[PDB]
Design a protein around this ligand. Structure first.
Ligand SMILES: O=P(O)(O)OC[C@H]1O[C@H](OP(=O)(O)OP(=O)(O)O)[C@H](O)[C@@H]1O
Ligand SMILES: O=P(O)(O)OC[C@H]1O[C@H](OP(=O)(O)OP(=O)(O)O)[C@H](O)[C@@H]1O
Ligand SMILES: Oc1ncnc2cn[nH]c12
Ligand SMILES: Oc1ncnc2cn[nH]c12
Ligand SMILES: [Mg+2]
Ligand SMILES: [Mg+2]
Ligand SMILES: [Mg+2]
Ligand SMILES: [Mg+2]
Lengths: 187, 194
């Protein structure tokens, strides 16, 4: 890992935290009557970064018998400096309607929260039975709009992280661990 | 699993098989000199089903120093049913151009091959440096159109399988193992639906 200046979390540490978060989520919905087909917990995976976190999380939720429905969404920037609001173009939205369902947006990392805040509100306006967010990493001090994730795997400082779905110029997403991109590489 | 007739592959087995296939992919591409930033192997993950296989395969590829760049597309054909609609719908195509790059389509299962045939004929025209496919499961005797994947983790019978990303009406994709869905379970759902 010559391109990394430090290891944040190993695959093992990540695996354990997700399991804890999943047990937590499971307990939290224990009284919502989740059932496959008719009342599953809808996971809205925001591409591309959360693809790895989502794969491991849904399996951990499966361990606690929480029936889920996987949705993947693809968003795009409108252009540079065209929005304050965090508005994004929807290239791929949910396949089914979330109206009346329990929904959980899955993200890899939240910092400014501009896009996640915009997405939260958009889905909120579609009337799901409930709406919450689970983010793997949270750069709490990087906010540009106020926003709180309901479930978070780890809070971290303002370092550029890569690995476990997280990229730098679309490189390193495949690492099993989360590491800090060393400055000399970004330079 | 009450809804399962039987387990085809456990998580451990799938894991074991994915490692061996990743090792082969590494050996086979060694001569291409794949490098991060300038020459990664482009992985085209076919959503939704391929999401899990893709997450575990890219890590296994990482173990063998194969640098990759992920592209996520979305294609639909079965919908809420058990059989091919006979039509393949492109919901989301690649963000970047595949022209001049080494591309590996990553799929969860191939049966009639209408999906992969559709994809190959679309991507081949874009002139990638090379185009290959890795499918987790292959129902070899279910073809409507011919198709031979470059890498196959396992050959299976024509029965409906779920788990490890594979669904029946967008249900069961989260299972850690791959299992055979009982016809009584899908039949009751089919009836409730139609
Ligand atoms: O709260 P923010 O300041 O927006 O930071 C976090 C977002 O940015 C990254 O996505 P990106 O735009 O990189 O797309 P990607 O997931 O496909 O890499 C990351 O994947 C989060 O979605
Ligand atoms: O060889 P074929 O008969 O074309 O069948 C295989 C395709 O059907 C399934 O996808 P589906 O259309 O169900 O979409 P999904 O991946 O979102 O579940 C499977 O994931 C393959 O993509
Ligand atoms: O450190 C970080 N690593 C990867 N993506 C993002 C987005 N915000 N901050 C990031
Ligand atoms: O067995 C099977 N399970 C899920 N999807 C498909 C498509 N073709 N065959 C399938
Ligand atoms: Mg993202
Ligand atoms: Mg990114
Ligand atoms: Mg598919
Ligand atoms: Mg399907």
């Amino acid at each position: 890992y010559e391109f990394a200046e430090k290891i944040l979390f190993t695959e093992e540490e990540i695996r354990t935290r997700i399991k804890e978060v999943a047990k937590r989520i499971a307990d939290d919905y224990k009284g919502k009557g989740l059932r496959p087909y008719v009342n599953p917990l809808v996971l809205i995976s925001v591409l591309k970064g959360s693809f790895m976190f989502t794969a491991d999380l849904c399996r951990a939720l499966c361990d606690f018998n929480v029936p889920v429905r996987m949705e993947f969404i693809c968003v795009s920037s409108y252009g540079e400096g065209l929005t304050s609001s965090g508005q994004v173009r929807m290239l791929l939205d949910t396949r089914h309607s979330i109206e009346g369902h329990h929904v959980l947006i899955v993200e890899d990392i939240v910092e400014t929260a501009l896009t996640l805040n915009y997405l939260y509100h958009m889905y909120f306006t579609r009337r799901p039975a409930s709406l919450k967010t689970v983010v793997l990493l949270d750069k709490r001090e990087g906010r540009r709009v106020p926003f709180s994730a309901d479930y978070v795997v780890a809070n971290i400082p303002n370092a550029f992280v890569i690995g476990y779905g997280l990229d730098y110029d679309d490189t390193y997403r495949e690492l099993r661990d989360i590491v800090v991109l060393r400055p000399e590489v970004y330079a």
